[PDB]
């Protein structure tokens, strides 16, 4: 049984987004750890691994639909040079997901592929929470001031 | 609390298809077990028990909607005389499910019955997986050869 | 502390090779799994995860040398459409690694970066074993024959 | 305490055979493992270690009889390039053992050295079983076909 | 067994450096503890004990090479009066180590003393990580501000 | 994958030395045990088993390199008639290993085969240590006096 | 809180002696261990670690007194070439401690610094005991005879 060509292309575009985010988040976590923000880095690393899960799920869906998962293509990394830049770069990816997926889900259901729809609805919900988390860190950076904020991202003592 | 008569009719149609699948899968597994393919048989038998669970969830839904679950009607069994035929026979039932539930779900949602819809979406998801497994079994029969595939279905020694 | 720029170029090239390998091995694993070769897929999946460890190790080193780990660039995937093509495709990557690392190690040592050299020596040893595994599988295919080899790669019963 | 000179010679010849067998079987196990026949390899390896135990028992007896255990001399290895060859090679050693030890035991008892007699009687009993196993393996190859037989020697999946 | 005279000299110089580092780091840990930066103190102290382990490993190698471990000689301590100074002082030792050991290792290998080479390669790897940590600490001080940074070094409450 | 002819020859010469050592050490332990030096014999025996491990490692590396491990050829055994002679005879083998492997390693690295080099470097480190142990035993005999030294080799009471 | 200049100088002279002792004793244990006197070496080593403890205590008392602990200066090492010489060399250090600390304590108490006096009194009690031990070892050598005494220092068998 073959999936709908547009649904499949939508899934591959999402796949590319996940692969991009895996790399971007993973690199950020390494950088964060390298700067001594070890506590922050553990969180960002986990976000990276969650993206790997999404990526695998999508790959599973594509193969079931008899498509070809695209592992060759990658989007453009935005690698931040400060904590703030990193949060904002990560926000950018997440917002791009929502813009793609919101109308994509509607399309999936019009094409009577609810299983694909449901998988993307799951992703939307996960990205909304991450977007919320990030936007809250940026808020706290302003409420706290950048130094005091950063201090909450190191262990005691710093390592 | 009375359900939409069309939604109700759809649910009863799906229940008929579950009860048919239960009998078909169960019998196929007894045959497989009776032929010597005991390892395969256990798998088929479990598939039968999952159909039972689906049938019961459908029954619950119908009763909740004040409908009358149809336990009288059974569709036409396709009993396979070879492992290949049995896989093809089970495969044909699942495709009927998809063919019915795809527009079924869209309809449920238009009639503003999301709970019934979510039940059918769950079923579509499981059926797709089972279709994939069965289609994959048939491909494996071609790659391995009939005899070779069949030998992976018996225990050691054969019981 | 600043790393030798050629050493850093070498590490980044190898990084790209690891990332290419992660994707290629992961996809091959999902394809093998989707064909029914569930026993083989588990192994291949594990080979993919070692590549991820390697990539992190190289990343750590690059960061320590105050370099810029490249997560943007990816090599050409070689995707196989049979078990044989897959083994050959994965072999081609590994062989590339050796050819790059054999001179690289000598070079790292001429440049007095032994930590980087030892890292790459470790990689070489691993790749040598993976190559030996792959090449042995290809041999087995011939000794046992395609089908019979394939049968050793499915569970009982097949899943 | 001094041993009879012919008994000591008989014992030292048997030792050479053990030492020969140790090396032959161990290399075979290595080559079988290297080939992917890892299940067979473990058995062959175990056979090598039993040979080591024989060799040590013979050494003990020689030392007790105030003789000189010969660890310098070795027989000619027959290294097989196929599973069948390896079995026939191993068989050939085991037969030489019977041919030597049968008259040897009668001799030991004639010379009233029953302890050496009993040691040699145990080795004969052990070699007969090993020979029988090798013969069965050669037979199974004929009954199952070589490829099919080989497949019973790999693990699932082939490691 | 006699060691090469230059290798032995290289080894004894490294020993002096270890002995120097042991004392410097230990005093620093004591002064950090004494200042109330008790969380930092424990890490620094641990660093001192790793130095002790290095020193013992070097001594073992010298003794094995029939040389004379020099425990009389010591380098000039650089005792810091601020946390920043202490970090810079400690850094200065670690850099001298790299500067000595880099050419030293090539020399050991030229003289075909690989065991001494490997020991020195391990120390380099360890020193690079320590240097990186010190650099990160210096950086964190800049990013967090000195007071804020210091506060990440006291316990709650300050003991 | 095919190994360099000089590296393979180097590895095989070393394998010959390991096999030779295994025999010499094992027989020495048996003699020591038969003289009543049961405590010393246990250590000598364990040394033999370590040689067995090295021989397996070399064998594996040869097989990976697609060479033929030589199990046919054994070096000349020096079998000591006193503890001192045994000690000295074992020293002579070990010093031959160092003699070969020192330029051997350098050549391995010139030929860009680091995995092989690293195996031999490990072997050299172990041998340097066994030489230390043996030379110290010989020193102890001179210090304590042979009778007294021998007494430390027996159990209480002697067995 | 500021300590008396003579008390501080007293404490620092003693610290210098502890640091000197640590080195002399540790190196002696390493030599003893390398001569095969492994049992004796363990005790000598533990003595070194006890000196380390005294040095930390003195360091703490100095810091509390607001002085500068001297970790730059080490006394003259007497490194014995035989057990007897090592024993005698260690005695000489210990007797110097008593020589200093005896009037040292009295002066401490005249200056109304009992905490410091009590630390030194503890040190003296420990040293008197280590002197007893060492003098008894030297007596034992005369009684048993050096060879025999040495034999009690090795394990069975010697390692
Ligand atoms: C037709 C409507 C049926 C319904 C709604 C139903 C429901 C269930 C359910 C919920 C279970 C529990 C196990 C599981 O769900 O996996 C079960 C077990 C079982 N089913 Fe059915 N079933 C039906 C008919 C049948 C038929 C036609 C057979 C033919 C053999 C059958 C044979 C069995 C057996 C032997 C068990 C195990 C009993 C036990 O474990 O004590 N059932 N059934
Ligand atoms: C591209 C840079 C990547 C890095 C640096 C990386 C790193 C890692 C590491 C170190 C692990 C754990 C290894 C272990 O525990 O054995 C891991 C797990 C995993 N990887 Fe990746 N990986 C990368 C890309 C990918 C890609 C392209 C996929 C495609 C599916 C993927 C899928 C996964 C999954 C599903 C897990 C398991 C997650 C978990 O168990 O929590 N990764 N990754
Ligand atoms: C001559 C060529 C030989 C080879 C290639 C060889 C190989 C090996 C290897 C690789 C081991 C691994 C030990 C471990 O992993 O701890 C081993 C163990 C052992 N060796 Fe040998 N060895 C040889 C000769 C001998 C001889 C002459 C004896 C005489 C008794 C012997 C007796 C043993 C025994 C009893 C063990 C351990 C048994 C066990 O692990 O179950 N070996 N050997
Ligand atoms: C030179 C100035 C030194 C100072 C001030 C010093 C200080 C100390 C102190 C106070 C302890 C406490 C031990 C205990 O509480 O049981 C200790 C333990 C120890 N010392 Fe040192 N020591 C010095 C030199 C050395 C040297 C040259 C070595 C050579 C190996 C060494 C190796 C060790 C080790 C391995 C421990 C225990 C490790 C642990 O507790 O985790 N020390 N040292
Ligand atoms: Fe995602
Ligand atoms: Fe996310
Ligand atoms: Fe169903
Ligand atoms: Fe189903
Ligand atoms: Fe890799
Ligand atoms: Fe690999
Ligand atoms: Fe035998
Ligand atoms: Fe046998
Ligand atoms: Fe160090
Ligand atoms: Fe360090
Ligand atoms: Fe060896
Ligand atoms: Fe050795
Ligand atoms: Fe003291
Ligand atoms: Fe003392
Ligand atoms: Na089979």
From Swiss-Prot, chains A, B, C, D, E, F, G:
Annotated keywords: Cytoplasm, Heme, Iron, Iron storage, Metal-binding, Oxidoreductase, Virulence
Species assigned in the record: Mycobacterium tuberculosis (strain ATCC 25618 / H37Rv)
Keyword Oxidoreductase: yes
Biological processes annotated in GO: intracellular iron ion homeostasis; iron ion transport; response to iron ion
Catalyses which reaction(s): 4 Fe(2+) + O2 + 4 H(+) = 4 Fe(3+) + 2 H2O; Fe(2+)(in) = Fe(2+)(out)
Protein origin, superkingdom: Bacteria
Subcellular location per the Swiss-Prot or TrEMBL entry: Cytoplasm
Molecular function GO labels: ferric iron binding; ferroxidase activity; heme binding; iron ion binding
Gene behind the chain: bfr
Known function: Iron-storage protein, whose ferroxidase center binds Fe(2+), oxidizes it using dioxygen to Fe(3+), and participates in the subsequent Fe(3+) oxide mineral core formation within the central cavity of the BFR protein shell.
One Pfam family linked to the record: Ferritin
Alphabetical list of Gene3D superfamilies matching this protein: 1.20.1260.10
Subunit text: Homooligomer of 24 subunits, arranged as 12 dimers, that are packed together to form an approximately spherical molecule with a central cavity, in which large amounts of iron can be deposited.
Any one GO cellular component localisation term in the record: extracellular region
Ferritin-like diiron domain segment(s): 1-145
UniProt keyword Nucleus, yes or no: no
Positions bound to Fe cation 1: 18, 51, 54, 127
Residues the record lists as binding heme b: 52
Residues bound to Fe cation 2: 51, 94, 127, 130
Protein family: Belongs to the ferritin-like superfamily. Bacterioferritin family.
Required cofactor(s): heme b
Entry protein name: Bacterioferritin BfrA
Cofactor details (free text): Binds 1 heme b (iron(II)-protoporphyrin IX) group per dimer.
Main location: cytoplasm
């Amino acid at each position: 049984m073959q999936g709908d060509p547009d649904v499949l292309r939508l899934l591959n575009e999402q796949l590319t987004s996940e692969l991009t985010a895996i790399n971007q988040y993973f690199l950020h976590s390494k950088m964060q750890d390298n700067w001594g923000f070890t506590e922050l880095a553990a969180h960002t690393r986990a976000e990276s691994f969650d993206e790997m899960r999404h990526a695998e799920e999508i790959t599973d869906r594509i193969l079931l639909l008899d498509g070809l998962p695209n592992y060759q293509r990658i989007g453009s990394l935005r690698i931040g040079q400060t904590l703030r830049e990193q949060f904002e770069a990560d926000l950018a990816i997440e917002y791009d997901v929502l813009n793609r997926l919101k109308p994509g889900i509607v399309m999936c259901r019009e094409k009577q592929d609810t299983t694909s729809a449901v998988l993307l609805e799951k992703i939307v919900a996960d990205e909304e929470e991450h977007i919320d988390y990030l936007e809250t860190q940026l808020e706290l950076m302003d409420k706290l001031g950048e130094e005091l904020y950063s201090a909450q991202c190191v262990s005691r003592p710093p390592t």
